[PDB]
Amino acid sequence: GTSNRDWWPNQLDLSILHRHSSLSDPMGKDFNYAQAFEKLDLAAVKRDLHALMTTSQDWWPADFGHYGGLFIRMAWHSAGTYRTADGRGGAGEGQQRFAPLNSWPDNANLDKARRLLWPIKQKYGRAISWADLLILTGNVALESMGFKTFGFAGGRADTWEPEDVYWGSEKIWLELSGGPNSRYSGDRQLENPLAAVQMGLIYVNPEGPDGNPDPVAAARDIRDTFARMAMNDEETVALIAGGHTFGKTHGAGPASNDGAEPEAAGIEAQGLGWKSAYRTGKGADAITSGLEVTWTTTPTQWSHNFFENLFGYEWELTKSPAGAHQWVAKGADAVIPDAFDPSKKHRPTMLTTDLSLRFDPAYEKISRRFHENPEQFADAFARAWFKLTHRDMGPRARYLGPEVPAEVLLWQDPIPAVDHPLIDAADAAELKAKVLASGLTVSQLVSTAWAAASTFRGSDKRGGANGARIRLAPQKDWEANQPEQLAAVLETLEAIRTAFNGAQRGGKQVSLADLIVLAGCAGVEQAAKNAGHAVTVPFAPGRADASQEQTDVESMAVLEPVADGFRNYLKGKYRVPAEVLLVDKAQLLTLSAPEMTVLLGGLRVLGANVGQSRHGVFTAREQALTNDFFVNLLDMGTEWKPTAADADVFEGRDRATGELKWTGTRVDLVFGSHSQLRALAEVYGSADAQEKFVRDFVAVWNKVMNLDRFDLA
Amino acid sequence: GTSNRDWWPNQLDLSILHRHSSLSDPMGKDFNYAQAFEKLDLAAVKRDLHALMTTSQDWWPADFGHYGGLFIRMAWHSAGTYRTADGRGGAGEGQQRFAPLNSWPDNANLDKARRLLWPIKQKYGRAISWADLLILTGNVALESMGFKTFGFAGGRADTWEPEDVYWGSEKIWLELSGGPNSRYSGDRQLENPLAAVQMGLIYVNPEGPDGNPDPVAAARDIRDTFARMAMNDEETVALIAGGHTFGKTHGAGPASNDGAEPEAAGIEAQGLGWKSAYRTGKGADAITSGLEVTWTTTPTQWSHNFFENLFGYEWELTKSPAGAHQWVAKGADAVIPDAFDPSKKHRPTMLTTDLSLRFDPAYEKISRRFHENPEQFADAFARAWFKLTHRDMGPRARYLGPEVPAEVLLWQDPIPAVDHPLIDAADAAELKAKVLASGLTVSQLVSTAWAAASTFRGSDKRGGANGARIRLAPQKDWEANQPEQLAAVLETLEAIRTAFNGAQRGGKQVSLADLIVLAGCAGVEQAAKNAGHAVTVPFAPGRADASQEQTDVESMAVLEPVADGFRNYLKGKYRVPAEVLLVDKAQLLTLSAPEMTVLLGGLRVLGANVGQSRHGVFTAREQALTNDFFVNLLDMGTEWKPTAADADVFEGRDRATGELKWTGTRVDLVFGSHSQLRALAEVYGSADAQEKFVRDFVAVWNKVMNLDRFDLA
Ligand code: HEM
Ligand code: HEM
Ligand SMILES: [Cl-]
Ligand code: NA
Ligand code: NA
């Protein structure tokens, strides 16, 4: 059946903005997962999970009698897709049960693990999400085997369809680098926003880079991919060694024995894949990756035997039964247990990527410290496992249940508690009046608040106006934020704040985070007044100010907007057309196409553009909140042509006279070109739309201001 | 950017069920287009449209000074995509402004017509939809040029994204037959559900079949495509000759002069396409189809000149300036006006497809009759133009405004007015009790009501339980309806009705249409009681019974379900897998994926299957309303394999014992396989979901029973 994407494969795709509708959701419109989870008996779930660890099912028998290693793998893969570049992937939406992740080669046989969990999911129903249960299962596995975890938070609501994520451009699973759609260039530079070395892998190739079994060069890929998932060298060593303290790999014969991945399998498979023709197809004959490695002498118990072995033996290169490269300790006795036959024992083995922890000189220092001090290893691994499995859950205000760790970690971008009465409606009105009397303009007010709020991304729920981090390094110096103009605005707002707070009795005080947002509200209200309309923009106090010491500057770097179409801003020149980058930003801001449309057309005429650019400012009444952007953009009396200077900037000229009326970028003009976006712009550009434009603008403005306000959930 | 469609190009696509969400819609959730239109001043709009007809714009100068012909073509193409096979296409959603229809070759330069209407759309805003306006404009054109129309109804609400329609499998615009994805086979048999001869054409090729200029063979294509758009020979001749009484074609030089169609054009084109390098690119130099034909001596006025010319001259095959085949009148004087130069005149010309109306023996009889009796032609063309432009609008209850024709036409599938008091709540309870006392089973009651209601399709709003057409030819004889079982149920219900109605005072009476639905309600209530739940099913009276004479049996044939997954029914063997046909049916019923899921799992256990098949009946308590289908389908204790006798029927056996537990079809098992549908089934199959399943079932049951109830809208 030929489709629009076939005829026009380079057109912009807006359906990414309308995923997750109420249509696709089986839960009623008022279902609140946090309410449901809060009443779950978590300890009962964990008791059922403990029992499951050693209750083997004949259709996928448990290695060593214990599913713990499988389930730790399952949870590491659930969380391991996460990229810090855009916040996409991670465990927070339970996407491992959807395409494509459910059928990634690195997720082979995790379909069995998820099926083992169905009886418990079924038992507890809507009170525990699949997303939460994958992580919780991993924790219970660790606990069951003697490892004390750092805690657990619930609150990952289930999703009901695949997320739209760029995982690469390769059309072949697992394609080696350097092909026609290579994700590498230069000196092994991986393209942003990717965080894995090959299509369908979680991070790296266990045999080594593109299959070359060189531990030293494998360590380079490890470090780069793990960094791209927000983990440093200590956390990386802890996580790899910690995970490999348990269970085994599966390669009992040749890989090709496996059948079709779950999305390609027959209907009779009922959602399972990789059906194997090798012997029984399962248990002792299981084939997953094609490697056949067991790391420790007690694969079902926490130990310090991974580093005892790694350092205690010299390693030689060998091949698994499927022909994959792996390593063996030949001088060793057969001390490692067999998964099914009590009369069989085996020599220690390792992956190339395990040896990376000993043969990369930076990793070796850490590994040795963890070898000599296994309590330090246990603590680092507990903290890194928590971070891994929670990194995309957002502000601590979202964490549910009885096991949440009380320690506040720097990576959580923490927000201090508020311990004082908040401003009321009358106070908010008094502050808006003071802000407007200071001389700050509508442009200044709206630009500042947009810059503070518009760092949010819904992918990992980082960013937003809470914290007043716009005043701190590095946000205060980001070029998008216009640092000298920003410094002048903040100085004036901070004097307003000091004055207001100094006049209060009884503990009442306003944060700078709240004031920056309220001041943006006052700018919007004044722009509405400039256009002849009285509106009240909603405002919800309770944001707090974070310190520079509570702000990891390096981790903040990924939130810098290098393209923000809402401010007509492009930091440099990109491969991807600017309109594509607009829709990507809209998705991260959780906007629909209509909301993206209204918001951009208001921002244009409010003076939100970086540098006071005239591009897209299609109004003779700037700083008034009107629908002039749309009226002017859609006027057929104006003809548009790309400039000689720059093919991405366009001149709009009177069609009859040739007089220059306007200039725009691709972000501006796409609203007059793309057939769906132009249909939207026509609604807002109609004669009957002045009231709707203003109302819908204020609503989306408010939505953006509140994106991180999980304290008000 | 690789997507799920790329990796698994044959997987089932559910996003067709969640189009048209509140996400994509710019209007607020309570916007009611009918209310808005009802307050439009239609007379004012029509005066602005009359004015526009001769207000020539320089960027697309009007032929002969009058845009009428252009706008009649525009309207005829808006309506001309309609297929009776599935009800998809047509003018009722204004889809001409979206991909792909906005860029179909046959819609070349209709992007200019639509842009000429922007100032009017903008003026009236939300009170007139683009969908209604394209039709209205056509009507005004006709009127402006002297032709009295039969009427106009408003009420086509706009849509905000492309509809999902199978338009063919060809990967090349306009590909001639017999290619790798040929839409023809056999003795020029066009594949259902298609109604055009080439990809990107409305009906037929104006040069003749696959470009061969044979009027007699062209007539065959005309007759077949037009029949597939619900028009007979009389209506076809009246429409073709009526339309070609006006305007002209455009082929002033070679076609290749045209540039990119609108979805491929640069951003600076602002939504327009087919930019021509030939001379001025417009007006006297316009190039649309590549044909250069003007049919009459007065192309801006209604006349009788089309038939005068067609019969009055002998025709010679010639070539347009672009090399297309067309016809010129032998030995004629230059009597046809030039569109721009008052000093130039032209000989009469015709398309191959115009000559079809003279050289096909059936058409020639009609054409001669219209030639000899031009009042008969005028009336037929008015009626056929109304039908063309209204055929997908649904029941007359949807028609808005002051120009709706009072005459009821057979093609509208008319429903008689109700002229008596309706049954109230006490009466409905009394009738449900009598239904249940008669001995009618849950299975009978539910199957009958599903058969009556489930004929509805939202594409053209035909079908549904209003009318009691299930008792009439041909519905009563459809295989899916189980004709012998159906006749026994209707006999019993009709004695109930006669008795009830006989006992009433006043004019109170119940229709059989209402009773069939009320009886289904009672069976659902009894099934809930059988399961231990106390459930009342909503019911809305007011359906009326249509007569056999108000029911065109041939036009009804396209509503026969040849595939109905909800009854586990497939009439024959088809190319498209049964799960695909399930989702297609869901879409026509306007169901989301969750509603499709709940409804099928309930229907299975209520005994709605055709022939009392056990396929998918995964319960030990048939005729009780429970969530057993889901619980049992998701039980990993059961293993599924395709049968030896039939690869599309499956046996589910105990994994441990081998005992046969169930049998299922692909429609059944897809809910256990497809990753998104299995996610849905898991919600309904959970321990906490029995009450949610019952509730959700009753809601969707009721939605289906009310799909045609535009009298209640
Ligand atoms: C360089 C990074 C890593 C590499 C290349 C990697 C590689 C692999 C491979 C190839 C397998 C075998 C799959 C099979 O054949 O069954 C596996 C198993 C496993 N991995 Fe990793 N691993 C990495 C990091 C992690 C981390 C961070 C964790 C958890 C903290 C994890 C925990 C496990 C567990 C528990 C198993 C055993 C599965 C079972 O017993 O069924 N690994 N690893
Ligand atoms: C066999 C069916 C038909 C064929 C093959 C056909 C073909 C065409 C073509 C090739 C043109 C020229 C487009 C251009 O170059 O500008 C056109 C024009 C037009 N057709 Fe048809 N036509 C059909 C039916 C209809 C019907 C059913 C109507 C209306 C009831 C219609 C009304 C018009 C009008 C008014 C024009 C004039 C456009 C103008 O003046 O700009 N035609 N037709
Ligand atoms: Cl994601
Ligand atoms: Na994420
Ligand atoms: Na339709």
What CATH number is attached to the domain comprising A414?
1.10.520.10
Q: Is B66 one of the catalytic residues?
A: no
Write the CA distances from B75 to A303, B78, B313, B388, integer angstroms: 77, 5, 30, 10
Q: What are the DSSP E strand ranges found in B278-412? A: 315-319, 325-329, 336-337, 345-346, 349-350
Exactly one of A66, A77, A250, A674 is catalytic; name it. A77
Residue A660: Cβ within 10 Å count: 10
CB-based contact A23:B18 (threshold 8 Å): yes
State the sign of the Cα–Cα–Cα–Cα dihedral A611, A613, A619, A620. positive
- Provide the residue type at B263 as one letter: E
Query: Is there a single domain that holds both residue A247 and residue A348?
Result: yes
Residues 6+ positions from B184 with CB-CB distance below 8 Å: B177, B178, B190, B191
- Let me know whether B198 and B315 are in one domain: yes
| Closest ligand, as measured to the CA of A165 | 3
B59 with A655: Cβ contact below 8 A: yes
C-alpha B561/C-alpha A180 separation (Å) is 48
Looking at the partner chain, which of B24, B127, B687 has a beta carbon nearest the beta carbon of A592? B24
Q: Which ligand is nearest to the CA of A164?
A: 3
Q: Which residues of B touch A20 (CB under 8 A)?
A: 23
Gap from B396 CA to chain A (nearest CA, Å): 28
Q: Which of B559, B687, B700 is nearest to B626 (CA)?
A: B687
| Inter-chain CB proximity B270 and A673 less than 8 Å | yes
- What are the φ and ψ backbone dihedral angles of A484, each rounded to 5 degrees? -70, -45
Last residue of a domain, one of B345, B372, B399: B372
> For residues A630 and B678, what is the distance between their CA atoms, to the nearest angstrom?
44
Select from B204, B106, B104 the least CA-distant residue to B162.
Answer: B104
Token digits for B243?
């339309």
Asked if residue A293 has its Cβ within 6 Å of ligand 1, the reply is no
Whether residue B291 sits in one domain with residue B229: yes
Judge whether B544 and B458 are in contact, CB under 8 Å: no
Is any ligand 1 atom within 6 A of the Cβ of residue A289?
yes
Residues 6+ apart with CB under 8 A from B657: none
Q: What is the distance in angstroms between the CA of the first residue and the CA of the last residue of chain A? A: 44
B244 labeled binding residue: yes
Chain A positions touching B129 (Cβ under 8 A) are none
Total domain count for chain A?
4
B683's CB contacts (< 8 A; 6+ apart) are A26, A27, A125, A126, B689, B692
Residues in a beta bridge with A248: A294
CATH number of A297's domain: 1.10.420.10
Q: Which domain holds residue A497?
A: 408-564+689-713
B chain contacts of residue A59, beta-carbon cutoff 8 Å: 636, 655
Nearest CA residue ID for atom 25, ligand 2: B240
Block residue for tokens 């089934």: B681
Ligand 1 atom index nearest CA of A218: 1
- The answer to whether A523 touches A617, Cβ cutoff 8 Å, is no
Q: Does residue A42 share a domain with residue A31?
A: yes
Angle, helix B42-53 to helix B130-144, in steps of 10 degrees: 60
- The last residue of one of the domains, among B372, B395, B425, is B372
Name the H helices within B473-531.
Answer: 483-502, 512-530
State if residue A662 touches ligand 1 by the CB under 6 angstroms criterion: no
Supply the angle between the helices B352-359 and B215-228 in degrees, to the nearest 10.
90
Give the three-state DSSP class for B329.
Answer: strand
Residues B401 and B368 in one domain: no
Q: Whose CA is nearest to atom 14 of ligand 2?
A: B249
H-helix or E-strand containing A661?
strand A660-665
Sign of CA dihedral A387, A392, A394, A396: negative
Taking Cα atoms as reference points, which of B537, B694, B586 lies closest to residue B630?
B694
Ligand 1 pocket test, candidate residues A204, A223, A228, A240, most atoms within 8 A of CB? A240
Query: Which experimental technique did the depositors report for determining this structure?
Result: X-ray
State if residue A73 touches ligand 1 by the CB under 6 angstroms criterion.
Answer: yes
> Which residue in chain A has the smallest CA separation from B4?
A100
Give residue numbers after which chain A breaks (C–N above 2.5 Å): none
- Whole-number CA gyration radius for chain A: 28
Quote the CA–CA distance of B547 and B528 in Å, as a whole number.
Answer: 35
Q: What are phi and psi of A473, to 5 degrees?
A: -70, 145
- On whether both A143 and A114 belong to a single domain, the answer is yes
- Give yes or no: residues B76 and B190 share one domain: no
Residue A339 Cβ < 6 Å to ligand 1: no
CA of A458 from ligand 3 middle (Å) equals 10
DSSP labels for A115-140? HHTHHHHHHHGGGS-HHHHHHHHHHH
Distance in angstroms (rounded) separating the CA atoms of residues B36 and B39? 6
A70 lines ligand 1 (CB under 6 A): yes
Structure-block tokens of residue B150: 């039969």
Within A643-689, residue ranges assigned H as helices are 666-669, 675-684
Q: How distant is the Cα of B111 from the closest Cα of chain A, in angstroms?
A: 11
A70, A194: one domain: no
List chain B residues with CB under 8 Å of A194.
Answer: none
CA of B452 to the centre of ligand 5 (A): 21
Which residues from chain B sit within 8 angstroms of residue A1, using beta carbons? 166-169
Least CA distance to B579: which residue of chain A? A267
Q: Are residues B63 and B136 in the same domain?
A: yes
Q: Which two tokens stand for residue A283?
A: 């248990």
Sign of the C-alpha dihedral, residues A388, A393, A396, A401?
Answer: negative
Give B640's strand partners. Answer: B652
Task: Tell which phi-psi region holds residue B300, choosing left (phi > 0), alpha (psi between -120 and 50) or beta.
Answer: alpha
Shared-domain flag, residues B157 and B233: no
Say yes or no: A281 and A155 in one domain. Answer: no
> Residue B122 and residue A685: Cβ atoms within 8 Å?
yes
Q: Is B309 touching ligand 2 by the criterion CB < 6 Å?
A: no
Nearest to A67 by CA among A242, A240, A246: A246
Shortest distance, CA B333 to any CA of chain A (angstroms): 40
- For residue A457, the ligand closest to its alpha carbon is 4
For residue A82, give the nearest of A93, A71, A74, A72 by alpha carbon: A93
- Resolution in angstrom units: 1.8
Indicate whether A306 and A391 sit together in one domain: no
- Measure the CA–CA gap between B71 and B112, rounded to whole angstroms: 10
A27, A98, A678 ranked by CB distance to B271: nearest = A678
Chain B nearest C-alpha distance from A22 (Å): 7
What ligand 2 atom has the least distance to the C-alpha of B242? 30
Q: Are the beta carbons of A469 and A461 closer than 8 angstroms? A: no
d(CA B39, CA B33): 10
Question: Which residue do the tokens 């470090």 mark?
Answer: A223
**Which tokens is A689 given?**
């739309």
Place of tokens 């009705």: B497
Look up residue B292 and give its two tokens: 């250069």
**Separation between Cα atoms, residue B299 and residue B346, nearest integer Å:** 12
Q: Whose CA is nearest to atom 7 of ligand 1?
A: A206
| Helices A442-453 + A483-502 axis angle, to 10 | 90
Q: Do A271 and B675 touch (CB under 8 A)?
A: yes
Instruction: DSSP letter for B29, please.
Output: T
